[PDB]
Amino acid sequence: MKSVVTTVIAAADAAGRFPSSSDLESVQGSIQRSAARLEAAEKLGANLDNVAQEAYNACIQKYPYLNNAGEANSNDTYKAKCLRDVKHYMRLIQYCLVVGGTGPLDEWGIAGQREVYRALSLPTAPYVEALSFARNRGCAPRDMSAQALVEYNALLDYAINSLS
């Protein structure tokens, strides 16, 4: 699961090394940056439902064709699964803020996403528009501290980049 500490352990292990000065120095980064990303994780964790709900609403608002008979937001099962998916991405982003790496999103969100959406005819633009809205929406300090918001925004951009 990619984090600061698993990245340096994997590197030390491939070289057959004990933790050395650059490994300890790396983890001090986690000690320093953890306050901002844990803050972002607490804020997102507390309000997941409303954050995902408006991102979902914004992507259906941009693409109302999805509501027509036979399109991906056209029945209450599809509607519920579309909002669930947006929530899944936001949850994995919360996990990335707790871990201080992209591991959770890489393993549980990004891996397979293109094969899944292709097979089920799910267009990617509405996924990008949900995340893009969430990316443009936050401001500091209203929603979280400035550095918390930098971490939140970076992980939304990472997700956007994975689908773009």
Partner 1 sequence: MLDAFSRAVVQADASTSVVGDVSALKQFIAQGNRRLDAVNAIASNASCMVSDAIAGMICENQGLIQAGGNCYPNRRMAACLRDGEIILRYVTYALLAGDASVLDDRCLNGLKETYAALGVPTTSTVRAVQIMKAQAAAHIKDTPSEARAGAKLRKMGSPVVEDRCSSLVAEASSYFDRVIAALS
Interface positions with partner 1 (CB under 8 A): 1, 3, 5-6, 8-10, 12-13, 16-20, 23-24, 27-28, 30-31, 34-35, 38, 41-42, 44-45, 48, 70, 88, 91, 94-95, 98-100, 103-104, 107-113, 115-116, 119-121, 132, 135-136, 139-140, 146, 149-150, 153-154, 157-158, 160-161, 164
Distance CA(140)–CA(153), nearest Å, equals: 11
In Å, how far are 26, 27, 44, 130 from 38, measured between CA atoms?
A: 18, 15, 10, 23
Contact 160, 131 (CB under 8 A): yes
- Cis check: omega of the bond before 64, within 30 degrees of 0: no
Q: Which of ligand PEB, a copy of itself, partner 1, none lies near 104, with the C-beta cut-off 5 to 8 A by kind?
A: partner 1
> Which member of 5, 12, 122, 150 binds ligand PEB (CB under 6 A)?
150
Q: Which of ligand PEB, partner 1, a copy of itself, none lies near 123, with the C-beta cut-off 5 to 8 A by kind?
A: a copy of itself
